[PDB]
Amino acid sequence: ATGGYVQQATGQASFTMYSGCGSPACGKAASGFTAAINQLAFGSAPGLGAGDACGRCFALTGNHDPYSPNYTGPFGQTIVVKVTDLCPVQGNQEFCGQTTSNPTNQHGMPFHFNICEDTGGSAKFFPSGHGALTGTFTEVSCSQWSGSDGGQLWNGACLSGETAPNWPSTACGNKGTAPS
């Protein structure tokens, strides 16, 4: 996509949980299941505002635990998240370090979602005792996402992806150039 970001409607991803998503990189939180996405897919860099992932909805399905590779199930449920946040390359090399020089992370995945714990997504998705998974994602209509958006936290905040056709397409737009 514009900026050299890698933004595909479907693919393979790794998954982790995180806490504290009330002031996320898109500049609006959402009261429903949400995630951060790795920088190369987010479409912006820290401090440059919303990227084109902002507001888009994705169905996430886990089917492997890379840290418990002998585990065959049960996995959690498929969940639909709205992307509100950025997982920067800096400080997140293992899961979010995809760049234009090396477009997969340490688990071989070209995308990563950090599912926010606060609003319940992680408890639905991760079986008890598992904090990292790999699997698939598919961008879906936000008709499949439940909840309401939060208020704008700063000028330029954007969740416009929530009404966009799937990638490739443009809603909030990408900022700057993808990490290398």
Ligand SMILES: CC(CCO)CCO
């Ligand atoms: C998704 C990140 C948000 C703060 O940079 C946290 C990853 O643990």
